[PDB]
Swiss-Prot record, chains A, B:
GO terms for molecular function: DNA binding. Keywords: Cytoplasm, DNA-binding, Repressor, Transcription, Transcription regulation, Virulence. GO terms for biological process: regulation of DNA-templated transcription. Involved in the regulation of virulence genes. Acts as a repressor of the agr locus and consequently targets genes regulated by the agr system such as sspA, hla and hlb. Binds directly to the agr promoter region. This is HTH-type transcriptional regulator SarX. Its main location: cytoplasm. It is found in: Cytoplasm. One of its GO terms (cellular component) is cytoplasm. Pfam families: Staph_reg_Sar_Rot. Residues 48-71 bind DNA. It comes from Staphylococcus aureus (strain USA300). Belongs to the SarA family. It comes from the Bacteria. The keyword DNA-binding applies.
Amino acid sequence: TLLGFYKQYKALSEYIDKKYKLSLNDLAVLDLTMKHCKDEKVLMQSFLKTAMDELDLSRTKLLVSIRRLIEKERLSKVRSSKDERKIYIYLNNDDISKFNALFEDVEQFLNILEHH
Amino acid sequence: TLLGFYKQYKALSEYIDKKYKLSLNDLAVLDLTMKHCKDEKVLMQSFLKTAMDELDLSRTKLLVSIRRLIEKERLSKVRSSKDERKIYIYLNNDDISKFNALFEDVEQFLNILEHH
């Protein structure tokens, strides 16, 4: 069951990587943004604080994930308007359908792995 | 369930890393040395062949796990005296003792994690 768990993680991790060019860190971050950012803009700084705390990653590794997500069009960003130093992240409606598709696919691959 | 699994994996990895200075890849390989070089010295080029076959890891990956397991004195190697200067890997009785103590401890921690 240790070895079992190792096979699950490797298979799962290869699947996500070959299919969506994301890591599990990426999916952990994306899932956070769903809870804290559903069609409501959130300041990076505030999100990074919640995120570092909840997922025990470095600030540095989170920004890698956040950049990758926005680069791959799974998460949105906005600057300004008033203050050109406050950046905001958010999930729009297409980001959300994408989120629903990625996780149904990924969670269902995990259900299968959890048997064989 | 996705984030659950991620949490489990993060915690197990960190436990193995902090307490044993090993990775999951290592444990997997060690488990594999236990199904193959418990009773015989085994030729390393022969181990890897059946290792990649059964674990699907990078040859490049395996050679670093093996070497770490020997450096950590959880696996043993010897150099043919006879005609080749080829390398054999094997588990001795101290190694097998360390193997059972290691897997007992890690399986028990995994068991704890799989309840929360």
